[PDB]
Amino acid sequence: MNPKRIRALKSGKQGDGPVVYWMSRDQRAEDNWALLFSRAIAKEANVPVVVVFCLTDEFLEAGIRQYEFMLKGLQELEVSLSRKKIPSFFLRGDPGEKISRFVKDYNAGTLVTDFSPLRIKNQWIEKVISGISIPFFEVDAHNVVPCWEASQKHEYAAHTFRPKLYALLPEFLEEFPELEPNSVETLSDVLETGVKALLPERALLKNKDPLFEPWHFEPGEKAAKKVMESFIADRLDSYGALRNDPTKNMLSNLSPYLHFGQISSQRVVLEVEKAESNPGSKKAFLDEILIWKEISDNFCYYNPGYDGFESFPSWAKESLNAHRNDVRSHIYTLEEFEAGKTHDPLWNASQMELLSTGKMHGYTRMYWAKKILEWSESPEKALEIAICLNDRYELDGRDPNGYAGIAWSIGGVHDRAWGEREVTGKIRYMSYEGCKRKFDVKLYIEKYS
Ligand SMILES: Cc1cc2nc3c(=O)[nH]c(=O)nc-3n(C[C@H](O)[C@H](O)[C@H](O)COP(=O)(O)OP(=O)(O)OC[C@H]3O[C@@H](n4cnc5c(N)ncnc54)[C@H](O)[C@@H]3O)c2cc1C
């Protein structure tokens, strides 16, 4: 149990009641440093550990697709935790008000939460800190190397972050100890009432049939493990060669599970390290799930304006500014982008993959966001549109990887300058013709009519 994974958010007077783990980002019972640390603190204090989860007022900003995925996962989690004699409490409302009251009502001794660098989590932490008198800790349960340890600053490139992270893997890549058992309404009801509130905004085909197909990704810890196991057995050997081909299903498909914390990336890395596969494919995959994922936490943690133009590198701000008044080839509205009504069939197909499955292939996500910049009035408007659509329709959205990936695509964050073009300046350009040279674009379009 490495103390560098835990940080104090508030010093206080420890009460004599249970240790409370305010679960938010890491919705799993296994392989969860925040839960393991909470259990250990409870044991030292001779008290039980309890889990509290807040169903917040912002769920109406996304869709049924994410709400059902998350809640079905929590139904399974409640059962798993209760098998370890760990009670779970699901609070409906504002974390500031609901967690503060719970701590007081239940005489909590200590409060622990998991780590997210997103602004909304910081908003909740501020409100909770001002309403409690007990000690408050946060644990990085999402990254292999704690975010505040991997680097002390924003890293401008994968190649500056990569040796810092790999230097620390020997310390922080380790097996998990087993979770020791201990010595306010039904989730089915919350899901029903929330779905009924979301129904008017469900994405529909003109037929009135819903667009979303829920059968592509089954939610929960158990299903996540099966996805990991099948990736290692069936897809890892080809990952290096085929990861950029959206006509093949050769990615891990782990991002929805990783986003909600239904599986630990440290677990995935342990299992991939011990698998014998193509060394090139293993290297490629580890670069994505270690370097690119954890540098996205680095980006959001050290850049308070991670969702704005101000966080782009200076070379990219200067270049995009120099091309602000260039005439754009096309300008689409939010609603035209949302419905896949551009002139570009590959763009529209990528949007239909997103609408129907909730998970756009990683290669076309790059293409998709870069064309929003090309066909938007300004870089700021492009950022707003890409974030809006990514977060509304991706199962893995509302995530540091989403803000960092959009910033990479539109603002060159973690990229370098390329040849200068009109409108997009020196931001890496991705052409339709260049995609045709790299995969069977007609097959991807035919699949997503
Ligand atoms: C415009 C844009 C928006 C994106 N939005 C999100 C998002 O909202 N949520 C999200 O989790 N990822 C996002 N990404 C990153 C990436 O596209 C997805 O993580 C990946 O496609 C998920 O599919 P997978 O798990 O099957 O991928 P695999 O290729 O199997 O990768 C394994 C994991 O590595 C990580 N990873 C892979 N590529 C990236 C990357 N470019 N940046 C950061 N981490 C990466 C992810 O954790 C991923 O699950 C975005 C990328 C772009 C260009």
Same domain, 422 and 286: no
Torsion of CA 424, 429, 430, 432, to 10 degrees: 60
Q: How far apart are CA 358 and CA 448, in angstroms?
A: 13
Q: End of a domain among 308, 340, 372?
A: 308
Residue nearest to ligand 1 atom 12, measured at CA: 401
Binding site listing for FAD: 239, 252-255, 288, 359, 365, 390, 396, 401
* Same domain membership, residue 154 and residue 124: no
Contact predicate 172/77, CB 8 Å:
no
**Which ligand 1 atom is at minimum distance from the Cα of 231?**
30
Please tell me whether residues 132 and 146 are part of one structural domain. no
Distance CA 177, CA 256 (A): 25
Domain co-membership, 169 together with 300? yes
| 258-263-267 Cα angle (round to 5) | 110
Read off the tokens for 18.
């249970």
Closest CA to 259 of 383, 354, 118: 118
Measure 204 CA to ligand 1 centroid, in angstroms: 26
Q: Which helix (H) or strand (E) holds 113?
A: strand 110-114
If one counts every other C-beta atom within 10 angstroms of the C-beta of residue 209, the result is: 7
Element (H, E) at 9: strand 6-10
Q: Which residue out of 244, 255, 387 has the highest number of ligand 1 atoms within 8 Å of its CB and is therefore the one to mutate?
A: 255
Dig out the tokens for 11 from the structure. 């010093």
Order across the sheet with 6-10: list the strands. Answer: 6-10, 136-139, 110-114, 19-23, 49-55, 88-92
DSSP states along 206-273: TTS-BS--GGGS--SHHHHHHHHHHIIIIIHHHHHHHTT-TTS--S---HHHHHHTSS-HHHHHHHHH
Technique used: X-ray
Which atom of ligand 1 is closest in space to residue 410's alpha carbon? 1
**Number of domains, the chain:** 3
Question: Does 122 share its domain with 40?
Answer: yes
Q: Is 293 in the pocket of ligand 1 (CB under 6 A)?
A: yes
Of 406, 409, 387, 408, the closest CA to residue 398 belongs to 387
C-alpha pair distances (Å), 93 with each of 97, 114, 132, 273, 430: 8, 19, 17, 41, 43
Whether 243 lines ligand 1, by a CB cut-off of 6 Å, is yes
* 18-33 burial: b if 16+ Cβ within 10 Å, else e: bbbbbbbbbbbbbbbb
In the chain the first and final C-alpha atoms are separated, in Å, by 51
* Domain match, 149 and 273 both: yes
Q: Indicate if ligand 1 lies below 6 Å from the C-beta of 295.
A: no
Structure tokens at 281: 């494919």
Is residue 6 located within the same domain as residue 136?
A: yes
Q: Please compute Rg for the chain using Cα positions.
A: 22
**Residue 178 contacts by C-beta under 8 Å, 6 or more apart in sequence?**
none
Nearest atom, ligand 1, residue 265 CA: 47
Same structural domain for residues 119 and 45? yes
Q: Quick one: which of 48, 24, 187, 193 has its CA closest to 99?
A: 24
Quote the ligand 1 centre to 401 CA distance (angstroms): 6
CA-proximal residue: ligand 1, atom 19 (nearest): 255
- Determine if ligand 1 sits within 6 Å of the CB of residue 240: no
The last residue of one of the domains, among 141, 156, 176, is 141
Pairing mode, strands 136-139 and 49-55: unpaired
Please check whether residues 409 and 376 belong to one and the same domain: yes
Domain boundary among 288, 308, 328: 308
> Do 292 and 323 fall within a single domain?
no
Could you give the CA distance from residue 217 to residue 225 in angstroms, rounded to a whole number? Answer: 12
| Among protein residues, the one whose CA lies closest to atom 22 of ligand 1 | 255
Q: What residue type is assigned to position 106 of the chain? A: Y
What distance in angstroms lies between residue 106's CA and the mean position of ligand 1's atoms?
A: 39
Give dist(CA 28, CA 80) in Å, integer: 9
Q: Domain span at residue 126?
A: 1-141
C-alpha span between 424 and 411 (Å, rounded): 9
CA of 147 to the centre of ligand 1 (A): 18
Same domain for 250 and 283, yes or no, is: yes
Task: Give yes or no for a contact between 232 and 275, defined as CB atoms under 8 angstroms apart.
Answer: yes
If asked whether residues 223 and 360 sit together in one domain, one would say: no
